[PDB]
Design a binder for this molecule. Sequence first.
Ligand SMILES: Nc1ncnc2c1ncn2[C@@H]1O[C@H](COP(=O)(O)OP(=O)(O)O)[C@@H](O)[C@H]1O
Ligand code: BEF
Ligand SMILES: [Mg+2]
Lengths: 765, 224, 113, 116, 59, 58, 420
Amino acid sequence: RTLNRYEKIANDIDAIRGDYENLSDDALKHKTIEFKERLEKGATTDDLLVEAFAVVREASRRVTGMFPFKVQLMGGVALHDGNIAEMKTGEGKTLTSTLPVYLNALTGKGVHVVTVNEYLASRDAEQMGKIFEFLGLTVGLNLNSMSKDEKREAYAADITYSTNNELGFDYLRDNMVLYKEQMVQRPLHFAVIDEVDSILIDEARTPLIISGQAAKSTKLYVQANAFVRTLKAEKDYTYDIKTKAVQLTEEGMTKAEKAFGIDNLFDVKHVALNHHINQALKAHVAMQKDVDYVVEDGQVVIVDSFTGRLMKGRRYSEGLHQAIEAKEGLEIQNESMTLATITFQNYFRMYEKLAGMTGTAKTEEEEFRNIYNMQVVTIPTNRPVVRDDRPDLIYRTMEGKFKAVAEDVAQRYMTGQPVLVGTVAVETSELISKLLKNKGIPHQVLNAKNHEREAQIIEEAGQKGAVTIATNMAGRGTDIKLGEGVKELGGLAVVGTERHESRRIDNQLRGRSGRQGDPGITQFYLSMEDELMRRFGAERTMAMLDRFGMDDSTPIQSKMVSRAVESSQKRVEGNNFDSRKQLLQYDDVLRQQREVIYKQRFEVIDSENLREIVENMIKSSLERAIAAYTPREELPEEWKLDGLVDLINTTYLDEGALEKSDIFGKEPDEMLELIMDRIITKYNEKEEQFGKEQMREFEKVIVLRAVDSKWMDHIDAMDQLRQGIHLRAYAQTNPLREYQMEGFAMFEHMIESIEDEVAKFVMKA
Amino acid sequence: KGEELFTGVVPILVELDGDVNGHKFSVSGEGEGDATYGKLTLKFICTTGKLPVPWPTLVTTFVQCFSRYPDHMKRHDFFKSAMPEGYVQERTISFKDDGNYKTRAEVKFEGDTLVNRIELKGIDFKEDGNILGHKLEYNYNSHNVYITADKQKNGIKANFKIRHNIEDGSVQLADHYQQNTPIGDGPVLLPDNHYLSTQSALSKDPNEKRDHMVLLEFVTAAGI
Amino acid sequence: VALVESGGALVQPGGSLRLSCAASGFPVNRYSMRWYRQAPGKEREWVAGMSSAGDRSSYEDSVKGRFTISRDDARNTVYLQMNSLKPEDTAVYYCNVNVGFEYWGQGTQVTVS
Amino acid sequence: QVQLVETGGGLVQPGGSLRLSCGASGSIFNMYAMGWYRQAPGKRREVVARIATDDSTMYPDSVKGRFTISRDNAKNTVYLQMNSLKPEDTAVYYCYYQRTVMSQPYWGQGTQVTVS
Amino acid sequence: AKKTILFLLTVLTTVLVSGWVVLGAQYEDGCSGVVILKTLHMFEVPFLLVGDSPHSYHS
Amino acid sequence: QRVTNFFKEVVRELKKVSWPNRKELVNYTAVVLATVAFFTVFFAVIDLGISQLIRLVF
Amino acid sequence: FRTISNFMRVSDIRNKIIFTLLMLIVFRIGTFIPVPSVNTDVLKLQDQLNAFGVLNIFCGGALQNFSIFAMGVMPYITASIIVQLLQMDVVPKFAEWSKQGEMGRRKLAQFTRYFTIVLGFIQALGMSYGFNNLAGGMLIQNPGIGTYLLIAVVLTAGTAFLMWLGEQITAKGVGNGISIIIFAGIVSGIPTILNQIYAQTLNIVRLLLVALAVVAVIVGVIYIQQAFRKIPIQYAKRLEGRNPVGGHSTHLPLKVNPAGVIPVIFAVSFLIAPPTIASFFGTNDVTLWIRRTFDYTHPVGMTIYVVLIIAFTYFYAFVQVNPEQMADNLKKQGGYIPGIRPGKNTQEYVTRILYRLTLVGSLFLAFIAVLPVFFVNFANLPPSAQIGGTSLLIVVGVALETMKQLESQLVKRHYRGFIK
Ligand SMILES: Nc1ncnc2c1ncn2[C@@H]1O[C@H](COP(=O)(O)OP(=O)(O)O)[C@@H](O)[C@H]1O
Ligand code: BEF
Ligand SMILES: [Mg+2]
């Protein structure tokens, strides 16, 4: 059992922090130099662990006033081992990140501390960077707004604080550079992932995708948007509430074919019109305004589903963003084109060491074992949870639930206890803010749109008589501190208003209330026309909401609706489980291909002579060109060798240098050797006249341009294959094996095209 | 908008009739034009017989709206202001050491398709020079068309010189003075000096019988 | 395809110097190569050049009777000459060929002073 | 490996009795099964009698009561005493042994008991 | 009425699971036309029945 | 006469089926006959082996 | 061949090949182990030929076996086909369990395992009682109900052990598990059948003609089994720019025989049920007539057999493919056949495709199922052979699917790169 090992190491650190206490600064900052030279002579980080942890304990008490508890040392040892430290919400996970981050930044290779958003990254960077810069290391903070030089300074520091999006995008942009000295990241060495279950379980359902702008079309967006704006929500389309899929009906298809003058919408010449009609339908019906996006400064800005904040650079793929901009009446932008793609599983499994800490890991433990080979370690609390988690108050309608929520917030405001109401969308947050505006209750709102005042709102949210309505922004890592007298009122009642997509997320909201042994109440007010119940509730229990009556002043005191609420949430969790499993194995196929391509593109970049690489490319292209003619079947002179001579003179050997007589009646390998040594002397004349390093610049540009263009086309073709592959499961094959085999064939044809393009552009230039 | 509507591929009809020294010629052809990449892939066929003046002396007479524009020169085009309304261009083409072309063309979207209706009249010619002696190599060079605007006529005056590879080993430097006129009178856009960096390619079809010119051509602009 | 010129030096007006242009990517046996020049401030004019190899070669009348463009296919390069040049013909000389596209040389600076 | 001389096949009137004697050669007789079957014409032999090594005798209900078995070890004879004969009991007869539970049952020669 | 024919086929398949009881009852040429052994060795497991919006960071 | 129209449709349908070509047909028959012959010999040999071990142990 | 030497050079492929062969040796070892109280000598005396072993008999023209694996995975087969028939609008709990996803599927798998144990018990009871009646009451010593339930629980333990062995050989072995065990049962029966054909023996050229006809029917089975009608599917939810190829296009493949072998399950249940219900009534005139006309080695019974194979192939092709569920899934995920409206029109489009393909597949299945009757009759073979029945289809399918699984494991090593 490892937990007794963690307790033993924590007691070791306790004895020697007795030893480390009476040391001045410049004698405690000297311990970093001492550990660095001991780590360069012969020691490992595992031998230095107790002395480094005692130095961080003393330095933290000297800087921040906090002296880490022994459960924080247990979580630090569990993070140094590469495990997942599941300390509860409020327990002190930021100091327990600073223990193994200091221990593993002494070797000089760099530690990445990953968080969920940029508020938490900047907050932790400020406080724990005060600790680390006392000790003598360097803390960079990698933000979305920085330039490449500031990012390179942030990654060159000893400890880098960033969010998971910026790390993924920096990796993807480092494999699109032309010079090696444009890469910002160092080799990936250690990642401490704060809120692991958000990053590695929840947000790992999505890939990071870097796009680049393609040509602009606008007329079909306005045409399809003007068509869909007259379309009668039940006769001409069906909106499926379960999976938010909007489809035309046969009346709507008839009206579409009449409005555009076409005869069949489902031809292969009207696939662009059908795509524009479908994306205008999804933009109108399935994408509600203040729920899914916002309109800021004449632009559609996406509100993130997990973090609940605006994603400024990010745009919807496949023409949905342009359909939303046509719907809103804004300027329709250009299309896009996927340049690079990675998932968070495949990104963080490149990291040579991976740790993590969260409050809510234990239910996902086997997933952390199957993918990341990380073991969830549960840490004690050192002070018991006095937080009061009351059961949910289920109502019939949303108007009755919101009247109850406003009445609860009103009667907690009268005593002086601070309230934090937790919604999800921006529009329900504004609805409940106007529900408290009349009733005369002064509040703050923390939406995606109110992100500028966030660090101010959180500093006032725990005062006496402080109502804060907050979306997903608050309920993940936000540390609300209680004001004077608030701990006697049982401070910070969290009033949730909906169930989220897992028990982990609403446990995180309750964790905003708890906060290390302080009192707190967490009441959830659900409803029966909540979006979780409407979308994932089973159709049996969705029939007796007339049986419960139509009053909504008192909650439904049943036990069949509580089973329905829990089963709907378990249905969402199972759907997300299978969706992230599917994305995992199919991006394992693209992960193998991408790792081959990116490793060889990098060693094209830092190779100070490319003659052997380009000559092997020309020889492989030439062997395939020889074997494309000259087949094994028709040996005696049915070999069409003047066509091969024409191909060599059009691709390799400048228009006159080969005749039929040079390769007449030859074996394929001896004509290969004849053409190949003619190619070598032509290359040597090119390298003589062209220059020596100028020739390397020339063919580096050729090779990298070919690799980039064929790899973007391969990402597109691989996406199209993954569209049709379940239809391949209709023929009683395994569709994953069909995906792997067709992806291998597609990849090898892509590499043959890379070699053909490089051979042609080098030899014929 | 207008030609910002025609970002997709465009059908190109070319019709040319003309006279040099009382000798008749009539060449037609069809192909495609693209603006977001800015290229012209055109299959042209001499439908009268033999060429009095050769194909290289024809190619600047053979549809300048199919340029490729990067993001900054989008304001600075004239050739997306008179379209789809229509376009008219006439040129004075002075051959040094020979006579003069006066070419007479209207380039407009007839129905949908880009039709270039050209009547060419070549005067001041002596037949024993190089052009009617057919001394041209089957090629066309790369050039820079200089574009400026005039506001008394509110149109475009274009100046350029072109260079024909003569088969004796010389070049015919010939200068084009070009006048460019709208047909409709909507939003005209008269920018400053800029230049079309253009390049071409002349080739043939191995499975075609008669005397035909295959044209492939790239246009880019720069300057502003 | 990438014409590179060399052989350009400061030549006094009584000395004649050949100018070489190495062709890389096409044979000189079947392409007419031309020698242009452009002085600083001047517009780029055509000086000399011959096509379809060796049976005919033309020049401009400022070098007619003086210059001679030659070539060698085994070396696959073309050569000019700067014989009897006057300070009026200070320029950067350019090697020009037309195989499909039009390829220009980088330019060799000769100033006769 | 152990030959069986099966004697006692005589013509009996239907409604009589008979004695069949399976004389074996090798004398160990810690054998898994011994017994007798018919295989008349009109095939699929019926196992008529069978002795376990614990003498736990079985019969089908076709010949139950009417047929008795006997095995005396170290005097290699297995006896089938047939009582209350019948015209459908007319068959050739084969003694058999089987050494162990995984052995193969090795037969004997024919003994035509004709009951008419 | 697809439920009736599907239930009739369910009772025929459990006839195949239970029909081993008729081996020697009425033939008396014991296994000389019984098809149960063949059914037991002739079959394989049936194949299983078959049965959001992506974003992108602009560079 | 609907049934002859239906059989013309069946023959028309069979020309859109993607039948295996002769190279993969020969490769598939080689794999099938190799698997059946190998497992025939494999199961005969382990039946002989288990039978001898059963004769030893009883 | 080169490819089987390429397999044994990769360590993982060779590891699971060797694990699969060890599990098949375990299966055969257990097939030599007798049942508790079954008195093996009367069992080995019951056969009409000479098989190999003491638990293997040649009864009814089939190599029967009465070890602890006497049932094989046959209760698992019939439990899975019953549960699959119950999912389709008969039991509603199973319908919503299938509609849940990968966790309601685990509920269906759990029910199939418990139903497997129940059906294995009922089949073991019927099998032990019927075999004891076949031997004349002499097969089971101490024929009390405690001995029958001992025998039934040990045969059900053997079948559940075979299902665990299948789970192992699909987790850590070469391919599918139960399919490898079924393949092993068939091709382990092969050598004693060859020994009977040798012990029988114009005859040498007759067996050469038989072997050439067997290779011809294996080629025909590979031809029909590997053939798909590929319906093109167009998705209208991505831009598909920049020269789409058209080579690896998306399509929906329908097999020519989409049913498989399951129509023969239903046809032989329809052919064995009248003789068992007539066997409960004792011998009569109509009992002997029912026994005479429902015997498919004679032309009236063979005609009823062929007609039921064709009818159940049509039924089970429309159960397996289900064009209405296919049309709804295509409408929901946004795909469409090019030209056809995605609602009812694609349902009747793929219904017409399925009618024609199912005609060809049903005739192939009926011909394959009545081929061993013709080989036995017109080749003077012993009736033990059953040479070219549906076990041929199972053997060909498992061999080809395991080969494709191995080559798919092989190609993850050959990612080249342009540098090399
Ligand atoms: N050892 C300590 N002594 C005193 N206060 C602490 C100690 N560790 C953490 N805290 C305080 O407890 C709160 C826990 O917040 P935080 O660590 O952000 O929670 P989480 O563990 O969810 O990130 C912080 O405000 C921090 O100031
Ligand atoms: F999980 Be914590 F409240 F940052
Ligand atoms: Mg935290």
